[PDB]
Write a protein that binds this ligand. Sequence first.
Ligand code: CLA
Ligand code: CLA
Ligand code: CLA
Ligand code: CLA
Ligand code: CLA
Ligand code: BCR
Ligand code: SF4
Lengths: 159, 80, 95, 43, 143, 107, 33, 733
Amino acid sequence: VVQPINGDPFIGSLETPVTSSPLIAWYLSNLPGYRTAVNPLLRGVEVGLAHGFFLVGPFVKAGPLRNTAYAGSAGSLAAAGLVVILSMCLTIYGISSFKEGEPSIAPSLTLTGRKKQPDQLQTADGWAKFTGGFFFGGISGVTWAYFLLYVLDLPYFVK
Amino acid sequence: SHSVKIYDTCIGCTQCVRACPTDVLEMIPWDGCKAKQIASAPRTEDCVGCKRCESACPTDFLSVRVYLWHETTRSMGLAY
Amino acid sequence: KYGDKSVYFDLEDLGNTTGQWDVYGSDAPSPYNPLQSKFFETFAAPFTKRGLLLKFLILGGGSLLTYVSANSTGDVLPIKRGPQEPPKLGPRGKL
Amino acid sequence: MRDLKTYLSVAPVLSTLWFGSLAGLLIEINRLFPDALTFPFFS
Amino acid sequence: GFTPPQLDPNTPSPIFAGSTGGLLRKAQVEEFYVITWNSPKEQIFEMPTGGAAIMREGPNLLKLARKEQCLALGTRLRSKYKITYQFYRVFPNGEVQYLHPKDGVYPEKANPGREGVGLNMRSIGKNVSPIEVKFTGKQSYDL
Amino acid sequence: GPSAQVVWPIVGQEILNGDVGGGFRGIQITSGFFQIWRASGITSELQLYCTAIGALVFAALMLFAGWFHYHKAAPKLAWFQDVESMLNHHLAGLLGLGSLSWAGHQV
Amino acid sequence: TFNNLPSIFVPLVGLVFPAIAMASLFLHIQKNK
Amino acid sequence: ALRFPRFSQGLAQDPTTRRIWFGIATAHDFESHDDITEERLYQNIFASHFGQLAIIFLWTSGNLFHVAWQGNFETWVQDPLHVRPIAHAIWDPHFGQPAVEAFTRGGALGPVNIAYSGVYQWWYTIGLRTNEDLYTGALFLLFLSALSLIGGWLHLQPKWKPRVSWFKNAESRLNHHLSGLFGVSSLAWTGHLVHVAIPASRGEYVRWNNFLNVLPHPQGLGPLFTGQWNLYAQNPDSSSHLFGTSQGSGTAILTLLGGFHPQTQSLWLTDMAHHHLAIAILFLIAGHMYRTNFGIGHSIKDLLEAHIPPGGRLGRGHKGLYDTINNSIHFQLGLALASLGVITSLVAQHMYSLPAYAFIAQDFTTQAALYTHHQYIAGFIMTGAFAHGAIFFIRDYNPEQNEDNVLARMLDHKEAIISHLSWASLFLGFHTLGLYVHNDVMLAFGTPEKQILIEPIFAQWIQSAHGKTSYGFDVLLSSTSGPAFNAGRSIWLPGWLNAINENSNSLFLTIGPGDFLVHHAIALGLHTTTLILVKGALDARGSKLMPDKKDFGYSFPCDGPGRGGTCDISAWDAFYLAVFWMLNTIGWVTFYWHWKHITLWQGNVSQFNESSTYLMGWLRDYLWLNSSQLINGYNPFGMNSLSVWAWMFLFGHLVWATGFMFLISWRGYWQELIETLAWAHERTPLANLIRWKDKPVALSIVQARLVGLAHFSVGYIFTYAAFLIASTSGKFG
Ligand code: CLA
Ligand code: CLA
Ligand code: CLA
Ligand code: CLA
Ligand code: CLA
Ligand SMILES: CC1=C(/C=C/C(C)=C/C=C/C(C)=C/C=C/C=C(C)/C=C/C=C(C)/C=C/C2=C(C)CCCC2(C)C)C(C)(C)CCC1
Ligand code: SF4
């Protein structure tokens, strides 16, 4: 089912099973990157929580102090630092890409041709709310990963 | 963008513009040669700078001449 | 018209022509619980001013970095532990 | 043949002939007169 | 005021199974250079975005990426298939600028009705040195 | 040391003819022709000279073949385009019979 | 404290001054008037 | 100008990312900035020079501050021969405890870096015997940096804004710079050496609290005003002097005894004092030459219009040259970089041989680091001198205002110059490579007696013309009966002879056939770099392939594939390929230096004199052998102090290879690759939300050339620095 995007052959993409399928499109459409209708703050919270855990993963066990007793604590600290930096670069991104009050640069159309509402994430205040959610969610996910490594160390692998 | 210029040594052979892939050039009438035509460059905004025009100018050095200048999205030849 | 037989240049609907599509941008409503959403709103609205967020991030991160590197001892980084070893005399005496 | 000699006179064929003759010359000189650093005649 | 633009209508497009060399976000915020041509038969041609397309019998329409794509296509059309072509420029606001002949005639036949610009009435060595135009916007070649 | 090349003493390059072994001064080759020849059961130098002469013969034959198949009687395009027969022959006739004949030598 | 000043200034300089500098310079790049 | 480049609205009107690179790279090309004048040009240059002085004083203050704070200078003063210098401490939190243990040198309680800059020796030779001295110096240089900054700020304000008629005052400026900036400056340096450095060498510390009381000489200024200057050369530290104590010291302040101090193997401080004094007299006299507001002096314009030879050999002479130099800042810059590069190479060639700092000859890594430094700096400065002459010939050269003059008659026979430089380089490369290869073969054939070994009779003649009796020419200084030896028989020649004949020091080394061959390699390098640069400069205005090259500027990629092809046709690309040949030449120079010196220091001069005549000796006995202790800086079992130099060695290898990417690969493969990348990013979900603001493009051809050369040269420099420092520090001979 490799017919082009929206059946439009002169747009540079295709509706292959990987892009446009009932399972993978649904998955890419019901996650906080593409929830264009809900406010960007909850989206950013979800995103930051997930990436905070994903970053605390390869800092405790993989790192300069992984074998020491300071593995979990200092690794979570480095993960929170990387999260602060990611919110930092997200912030300069929101400042540089769109200024203060312009309308959303997101597409106001869908595959079915409906003149949907534009994604307010791409606005200034919207991206700022998204960055705030990302920072809050990321620090929270870092400390929760630290908590789970603390109180529930035995089921997880140490190696 | 780029500044294409046609000097008065042109013989009006229409190779500069038949080689130009971006419609930058066009032949106009003139009274300076046996062919009674000379090339002009109105659409320099569409000039990428490929110098196919001056790789086909059969003169002492050149008559058409491309000067590299402020590069925009269309002079840089970007589809994005 | 964009929906005609192999017509992709609806000059009025330039979004469908140029490819402006939310390819996966579902406009479905908030699937979160309202109470936790309000909780996150009230607890992350401080991070709403991107400029204040950036100033806070840079200054507090630099402060925490200096604090960690100044209060950390040599047990967590060998550079502050010091030599804890006699110095070797270099070639030709020491020169 | 005129054209065979025209080809033998071409630059690579004549170059390899000339440098084979020359190389044989210098080779036989460095075999008959090996290991030469100074010109001793009327030295 | 002798040749009017053509104002391309909603014509059909060639039969093509879709590629990746097509229209990216440049079209969504800048021009994208529609081309229109008129085929005698349903024949097959190489697309400038890579891949083979099947042009339709009658008028066709292709919105590819940029000027060089449509002009390369049109040159291949005119040389290989001996077919009249004309292409445009479609800004995202809506305007459609006509560009390829701009006189109904291709830019090789020196047809009167076009003003000569980019025209220095001198040999190419008689341009002044840069010091003669130092600290001036005119670089070397606009006097 | 397997050696199959000797240099000419002219300009001191005769140092290249070294103590490979075998009462012989030459260059220690790294081609593995000696290993093949022990695998081909040569056990001589006469067989190698005969092989060289036969190979020179086949070289002249192939040169005549190129001359014949361009200048004297050159195949036309229907002959090359018959890839079916070409594969049937190069599989069975070159690689099949070639490996069979080498198995005969090997046995 | 003099032995503790590199521990304050090197993490300060080589990480924050890149943060400040690269951020402010990316903002200066991506600007419009 | 709307976007980041405020100085070029052609790059601000560039939706791609080329604008960032070109706003970095043209930031300091003021005469190409948009909508500017000559006033603003010169004023921005003046403020920029203030900023450069501020940075220079700040960097010197940082050196002083770190040597005072984190160094061991007070310990180095006592036992300098056996206490290691310390540049600055290190706080690298990536360090492991073996590396914390290995980098603890010079009697420090923490990791440190050994000062291979010689600043210890030069500060110790000029006084400065405490950390507080260096602290005061660093604080004063910080004050000087702030002074330069406020000066360059206020000289940009409209009230204090010099006009172009003030910058062009090339006679008042010359008089002032000569007289003050050289003569008075060296005079003040003498007034330091006489009042501080010599007393600090003779014992007592003369500081600001007591420098008015301490007589530099027991008879103060009577000998100077009464003309009896010989009373300042009475007790010239008669050969038993310990630098830093009164044992075997004297009372003289100005001498011409020449030669070296026996303890330090360096030049006498009294010789330096008398030297700076004498050249101060010369510069203060020469700075009263050019005409100024007082009615007397010379006009350089008429000096040039008068130096037109009758006969028309030079043609119109130097007519119209004052106006084409004073108006042209690139000509001033080119002449300046010419002189600066020559004197930088002179600094190198005279600091290795005639070291003017205490205990810098006997330490062996600084004496190599400084030479290598200043010679690579000189090569770069020389390439820049020629590049700015090319930029002059394009931008600032008016052929009508200097018609048929020395400069115009110069551009006429550019083909003659280029052809004869080509001849010289072709001759040298052919022959000397042939000889190195002949010797490589003759060793490869076990016949080293068949090698082409040409004894450098001319350099050996000059050596014997200075007092070296290692050859037996006995001419003009080795002959006792020569009048040149008889004239300075009682002034300097005893010390100079027991210096030049002493085969431990490094002035006028005993040279052999390898020195001949590598000097001819050096000549090949100089003539070839010169060829490339001169050819670019003279074909900068145009040639037959591109006669209107002046209209395209100095830096442009090419002229297209037409006319056969025009890759690397610009004078910028001549500079480019000349930087390659310059790095090659200075590499030959410094390889020669380092091997000759490391063999001298080790003791086996025979190693160089036998192995330098065939290239496999350099590849084996210099690179492969002296890289033994370096690459073992960190083995699978432990590391040592040379770990940093091995890491830097490999880092420089890495960037030197990365430059080959931008040089070999050119723009088009990368543009297409970036087009694929842009497709993928704009059609990759969860990254479609992120869209660039500057449209990404592959690097422009001239840019990527520059970037390849930057990586190439950084790798050249860092690699050879690692190797030189580690080899001379792994052993110190
Ligand atoms: C350019 C650099 C260079 C130089 C100067 C030399 C020089 C030399 N090499 Mg080296 N060599 C070089 C590069 C160089 N080589 C390179 C690059 C290689 C690697 C390819 C070698 C490899 C090499 C080897 C392996 C050997 C040499 C040898 C020699 C010697 C040759 C003497 C000889 O046989 O000539 C004798 C003269 C001739 C061959 C010329 C004869 C010309 C004819 C007769 C015409 C003249 C007569 C004419 C009619 C006029 C007469 C007068 C009247 C009629 C008017 C000489 C010292 C050999 C040697 O002995 O080393 C010391 C040797 O063994 N070289
Ligand atoms: C520049 C080209 C070149 C050169 C100079 C060499 C040189 C060498 N090869 Mg190599 N070789 C090459 C290309 C080359 N080879 C290629 C492209 C192949 C792939 C087919 C091989 C496969 C190959 C093998 C398998 C062996 C060598 C051996 C040798 C050495 C002995 C030479 C010989 O003829 O012994 C006699 C040759 C043989 C014993 C090879 C047997 C025949 C092979 C297996 C298949 C028959 C070819 C077939 C008809 C055509 C391809 C069919 C198609 C379906 C792929 C010598 C070092 C031999 C060696 O190292 O001995 C110590 C060895 O065992 N080579
Ligand atoms: C992962 C590799 C790695 C990293 C990140 C570092 C990091 C560091 N090392 Mg190194 N080091 C390493 C491996 C590494 N080391 C290894 C393997 C060894 C061998 C065992 C050493 C040996 C070593 C020594 C011996 C020393 C260090 C020092 C330092 C510190 C330098 C201070 C600083 O902020 O520099 C700032 C960065 C620079 C000065 C680089 C200047 C060039 C940049 C690229 C151009 C700037 C562009 C422009 C002009 C400015 C615009 C802003 C810019 C931010 C974008 C720093 C913490 C020094 C130290 O501790 O002093 C504090 C020191 O003396 N290291
Ligand atoms: C006597 C009066 C006087 C003095 C002292 C100066 C001094 C200076 N002027 Mg000048 N100037 C003057 C009058 C004077 N000016 C007048 C009347 C005008 C009227 C037009 C100008 C116009 C002018 C311009 C337009 C500019 C200057 C600049 C400069 C500075 C040159 C850069 C520098 O420091 O390198 C000084 C270099 C040396 C002292 C020596 C260099 C070469 C020696 C021989 C090398 C060998 C010895 C070496 C130093 C030993 C080192 C060993 C160890 C200690 C490291 C310097 C501060 C430039 C500047 O920076 O702007 C502020 C500049 O752009 N001046
Ligand atoms: C080892 C690398 C190398 C070598 C050998 C050369 C060689 C040369 N370069 Mg340089 N160059 C190099 C790297 C190198 N370059 C690099 C990396 C760059 C940066 C792009 C440049 C940039 C550059 C420029 C910009 C210029 C040169 C010039 C020259 C020529 C200088 C004249 C001379 O000495 O020639 C003497 C001859 C040689 C060194 C050639 C050696 C080979 C022998 C003699 C040939 C005979 C061997 C054999 C018998 C031949 C048969 C071989 C085979 C077919 C069997 C010469 C051809 C200049 C020039 O052309 O001046 C005339 C010039 O303007 N080069
Ligand atoms: C391009 C150009 C430019 C640049 C150039 C250059 C860069 C050059 C360089 C040059 C150089 C770099 C040179 C050098 C030279 C040197 C010399 C010329 C030397 C001399 C010497 C002598 C004469 C000596 C003597 C003596 C002795 C022997 C020793 C003892 C003493 C006595 C003194 C006796 C310019 C801007 C100008 C202009 C334009 C063009
Ligand atoms: S190619 Fe040159 S000569 Fe020919 S028509 Fe064009 S401008 Fe004239």
